[PDB]
């Protein structure tokens with residue numbers, strides 16, 4: 001023999017692109033039932049469902065996108081990106097620019113835009129006055145501060161002036177544009193949008209053990225890149241699991257194009273018990289949400305993504 | 321039985337199919353150079369080669 005591969009290849013590609021386009025075709029009514037009910041069986045499922053419902057859109061308010069674009073200093077940002085682009089400009093005449101952008105947005109947010117809030121500075125007192133504040137407790141939002149998205153205010157007593165300073169924990173990123181303070185929670189939230197506002201591809205990644213950061217998709221390297229605004233870190237998915245030695249159980253990412261478990265990218269050591277969900281009920285979950293999340297898109301968009309999907313699936317499971 | 325394809329290859333395969341269609345053939349080839357029992361089913365049924373593949377995704 002001398003079997004013809006070229007033809008057998010071509011023929012496959014097609015039969016594949018077909019099968020793919022069927023996966024993300026149709027609402028199956030058989031699944032819809034299993035989904036529906038599993039959502040009520042397990043809550044960690046509910047967890048992600050709720051998160052999907054919020055995160056997966058929410059940041060696409062060109063309303064917002066504007067406000068941020070107004071208030072940020074683009075003049076300074078681009079000034080810098082160009083400065084650094086001209087420096088080397090990595091490999092080929094390429095998309096490497098947008099990285100330098102994010103990379104820069106990174107520094108701008110840290111050594112410039114946002115300030116970190118451990119204990120709030122005492123307002124009535126001096127400016128630089130974290131130290132001498134004792135946490136009284138936490139409570140419901142006042143009312144001027146339910147006007148923004150806030151379930152909890154931490155309250156602090158200033159041992160030098162004897163005056164309460166409140167530090168309400170807001171979810172409205174725009175409000176976060178007024179207060180420039182926050183811990184990790186809001187630190188991420190805003191910055192996730194600040195990226196979306198330059199219209200890059202962004203996921204908000206949620207670690208079960210009290211951490212969040214974001215992934216951004218680089219066309220230059222074309223894979224997702226772990227970005228965390230808190231640490232002014234560009235591409236270091238390990239950080240948490242190794243430098244910090246975090247104990248991680250789960251990592252999910254929600255972006256307007258998919259919810260996908262990215263645990264394997266991060267939890268690469270100090271691995272926890274994985275179980276509020278049958279390990280492949282989870283798989284189903286995501287795939288379902290993303291499908292449902294995608295009913296809109298035409299027939300390339302839909303495949304072209306399902307590809308970047310596999311492409312990643314195989315970067316995770318390979319663990320390279 | 322079934323396919324009988326190496327975890328590693330099978331991965332590898334569905335990598336290019338998704339990210340490098342321009343090289344599916346020479347993979348798809350050597351992946352036959354290597355599995356006698358499959359050299360068979362290509363020579364007999366090209367089609368039924370295809371099946372068990374996407375199948376595993």
Ligand SMILES: OC[C@H]1O[C@@](CO)(O[C@H]2O[C@H](CO)[C@@H](O)[C@H](O)[C@H]2O)[C@@H](O)[C@@H]1O
Nearest residue numbers: 151152169170171185186187189190210
């Ligand atoms: O760390 C999560 C924790 O912080 C809260 C404050 O109660 O809000 C933060 O986290 C949100 C996501 O859960 C962010 O979007 C938000 O910007 C941030 O303030 C709670 O939502 C949550 O319990």
Ligand SMILES: OC[C@H]1O[C@@](CO)(O[C@H]2O[C@H](CO)[C@@H](O)[C@H](O)[C@H]2O)[C@@H](O)[C@@H]1O
Nearest residue numbers: 116118183184210211230231232243244
């Ligand atoms: O380390 C866990 C915890 O620390 C935080 C806030 O307390 O980050 C601070 O401490 C880190 C040490 O782990 C520093 O590297 C970091 O720069 C500093 O802000 C959070 O990031 C995390 O929840």
Ligand SMILES: OC[C@H]1O[C@@](CO)(O[C@H]2O[C@H](CO)[C@@H](O)[C@H](O)[C@H]2O)[C@@H](O)[C@@H]1O
Nearest residue numbers: 228229230231232233234236239243244
């Ligand atoms: O601290 C800002 C920024 O610096 C980096 C390197 O770019 O490294 C720092 O943070 C690490 C922990 O996250 C430390 O182990 C290291 O010593 C420190 O220089 C980034 O990780 C970080 O975002």
Ligand SMILES: [Zn+2]
Nearest residue numbers: 122125158161
């Ligand atoms: Zn004071």
